[PDB]
Amino acid sequence: SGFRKMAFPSGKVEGCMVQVTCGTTTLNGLWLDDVVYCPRHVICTSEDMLNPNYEDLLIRKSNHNFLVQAGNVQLRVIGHSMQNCVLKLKVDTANPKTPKYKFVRIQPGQTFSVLACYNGSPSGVYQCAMRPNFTIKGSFLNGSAGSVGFNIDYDCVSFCYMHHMELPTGVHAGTDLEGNFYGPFVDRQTAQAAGTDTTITVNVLAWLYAAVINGDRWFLNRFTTTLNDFNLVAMKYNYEPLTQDHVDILGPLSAQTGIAVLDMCASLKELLQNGMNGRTILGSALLEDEFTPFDVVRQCNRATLQ
Amino acid sequence: SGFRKMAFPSGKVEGCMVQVTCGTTTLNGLWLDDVVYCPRHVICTSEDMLNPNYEDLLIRKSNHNFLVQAGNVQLRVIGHSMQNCVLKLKVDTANPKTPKYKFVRIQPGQTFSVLACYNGSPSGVYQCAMRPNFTIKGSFLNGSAGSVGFNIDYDCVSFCYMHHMELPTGVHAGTDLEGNFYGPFVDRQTAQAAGTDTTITVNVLAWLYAAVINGDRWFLNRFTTTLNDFNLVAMKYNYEPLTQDHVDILGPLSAQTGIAVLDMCASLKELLQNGMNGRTILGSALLEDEFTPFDVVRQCNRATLQ
């Protein structure tokens, strides 16, 4: 019983974090085999961050300009490549703690765990979701760039996010591990803003089906709605329109419980218009969009053979 | 910017988790040097869990009755001691991944990070607080006993909780690492219940001072209250009475901001009686009691030199 927002265990990622310093600019890098991946703006001085020409900044930088430290071990840079917004530093030492890994680019709505680091030291770990506007509603301070986001399936760490910058609004933006930005953003200290943040309707649906499994069935269906109508009421509450793939992605949830997406969309229809009153669902006092279908079923209470 | 419930990085604890099996009963153990600490009810068969005599169950158990596995490595038990509700298995192999550690018994209100394991494999990590009734509002399934809770100061892991059982209500109960239970509970499958769960008022106060620092100052003080009056309104909302130590524990928060505990107690006075309306604080739509003063200041936005 119980229902918490869990991150994956962070140990396999902790063994890859290092400090990268170029000049008087320091952030974090991800050390896999003999390459350290880090945001490319580690090469920029304070003023160069308004409109950098990263090409030209890098061509003036030699290897000794880079200090990379794994704890008390200095790793010497023997070469570099710029790949999109991420800089690959080849180092003289292959990381003996490299886990089985891959790079994957996630989709908005999907969740992952973040290991927030400063000065190459892991600070803490927390679970989050890619918002539909491609930002993450994270918790990041200056010096946290290079912190990565990941998922762990069996023993294989799928890295999906590297952290670069914070938007004026306070939300965060970054790239995959190939350095391509998530969203229409750029690594430049320039006035930028994200689109309108919708709510991940499919995630809130998987959440309600969860409540139904564990026992919280207050506010359960008492009506119906054509997918279109829900979208109309959801539009006023910046709720991401619901598609039939959304209706199918629930998989073993409309079933294995026997309630319908529309019946749930109807309970959601009311809680967005009339409110939650004083009651709560799975502890949360607000509709939750950071749980996906896989996250839901893992924590759900099981049947007891007697 | 941003404000998330962060667990400490779990890696140092992951390297200590093992599987402990006695007979046909399996749970997790904590492997430090050449001792594995695990809940003592690993020695009980299904029926022995209503009213066990652990003394007598253990005296009938020899070392070979214990299978302890660290991954693919079997660790042979060479002796055991029962210490309160925790069983110490001495093993033929000292754990080379033992971090610098200590055992500490935390106080209700204090937070810690939980590494939930099944079959000796870390499953995920999440931050929680010891409730005033000594339960933890965790997320635990059968087989998760032996999962531990911890804090990390610098590189020293302070283990503070080992997980034993789930109450009828769905909340969780466990011991320190000396095996003394947190609360008036026992490792027996018997009808048990916790006291009334109060809210950690000092934690909600540190939270509001945080909101004030980061910028959310809606609902800020517009009145005053003698500590006594707040307690009167807090009594109806099962809010833990507020003491002057509580008023002093804020430390650099009433100051370093300049608002008063009572002014905050007054804003809290209203949000408990009239409500939060449609607004939220630091994202949460409910009053939060799982952040302490230290948790608050670490994540708060800093001043930019210009």
Numbering used by the authors:
A (entry chain A), B (entry chain A): 1 to 306
What does the paper say about this structure?
The main protease of SARS-CoV-2 (Mpro, also referred to as 3-chymotrypsin-like protease or 3CLpro) is responsible for the majority of nsp processing, cleaving at 11 conserved sites along the polyprotein including self-excision of Mpro by autolytic cleavage of its own N-terminal and C-terminal autoprocessing sites. SARS-CoV-2 Mpro is a functional homodimer of two symmetrically disposed protomers that are each 306 residues in length (33.8 kDa).
These all belong to space group C2 with C7 and C13 having seven monomers (half a ring) in the ASU and C9 (C145A) having 14 (complete ring). Analysis of the crystal packing with PISA27 shows the main interface between dimers ranges in surface area from 800 to 1000 Å2 with the ring assembly as a whole predicted to be stable.
